[PDB]
Design a protein around this ligand. Structure first.
Ligand code: 4H2
Ligand code: ZN
Length: 257
């Protein structure tokens, strides 16, 4: 099955998921000089006051912090979006070294990690229906740089020991995702895809310009997770990012001057 190694990583995915070579794949490099400010874009509305976290799961590729998405509790709207998109989960992609890990890049710069807050368009009723639609998902992407600690990330770092291996999960109620946001909601936006198989082309990407700072100890802790299951030889969960893909016939728009 697919993964991030030499033998089953991003260069191989197209054999089981041919859309890997499609017209709207993610991530991409954000060329800041080529992205045009779009004065018709709206501010983003991130409404997380009522977010209900439930569980954190090591799925063998990343860890997912999952939310109750059976009602409009934590939603994203505005920005480039029509309609209301419900938060279902967030996860990260990160590197074995602080110089690499993000999936999007900015003028070819890689950050140490990238947070993806995944939301689905409520007009489609559930997540599995939404991923069959070109406007089914909205993913808010936030870069992590290593510097000062991010206090709102520490409860996630604290629990990773309990979900070290593939298929482990733990209670993760009462987590406020507002503590993972940077100060500014200035963003770039473009149409793309999931960045892991099945690589579906359903995503409006909204990538914040301002990274959050995390400490070197926080990201070290991410790197102690395992891809493998319990009882299997240890494979550190690191470098679970897909490199930038061809932009093709797409424009990246900026919300800011
Ligand atoms: C929905 C989904 C799942 C895994 N990864 C990403 S970027 C998005
Ligand atoms: Zn992701």
């Amino acid at each position: 099955h697919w993964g991030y190694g030499k033998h089953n990583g991003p260069e191989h995915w197209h054999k089981d998921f041919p859309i890997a070579k499609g017209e709207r794949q993610s991530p991409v490099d954000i060329d800041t000089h080529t992205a045009k400010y779009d004065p018709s874009l709206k501010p983003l509305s991130v409404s997380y006051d009522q977010a209900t976290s439930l569980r954190i799961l090591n799925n063998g590729h990343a860890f997912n912090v999952e939310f109750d998405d059976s009602q409009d509790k934590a939603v994203l709207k505005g920005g480039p979006l029509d309609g209301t998109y419900r938060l279902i989960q967030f996860h990260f992609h990160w590197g074995s070294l602080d110089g690499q890990g993000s999936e999007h890049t900015v003028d070819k710069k890689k950050y140490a990690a990238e947070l993806h807050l995944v939301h689905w368009n409520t007009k489609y009723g559930d997540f599995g229906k939404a991923v069959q639609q070109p406007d089914g998902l909205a993913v808010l992407g936030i870069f992590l740089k290593v510097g000062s600690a991010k206090p709102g990330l520490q409860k996630v770092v604290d629990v990773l020991d309990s979900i070290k291996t593939k298929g482990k999960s733990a209670d993760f109620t009462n987590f406020d995702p507002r503590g993972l946001l940077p100060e500014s909601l200035d963003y770039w936006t473009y149409p793309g895809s999931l960045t892991t198989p099945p690589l579906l082309e359903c995503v409006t990407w909204i990538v914040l310009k301002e990274p959050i700072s995390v400490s070197s100890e926080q990201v070290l802790k991410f790197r102690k997770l395992n891809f493998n299951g319990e009882g299997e030889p240890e494979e550190l969960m690191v470098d679970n990012w897909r490199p930038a893909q061809p932009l093709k016939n797409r424009q990246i728009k900026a919300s800011f001057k």
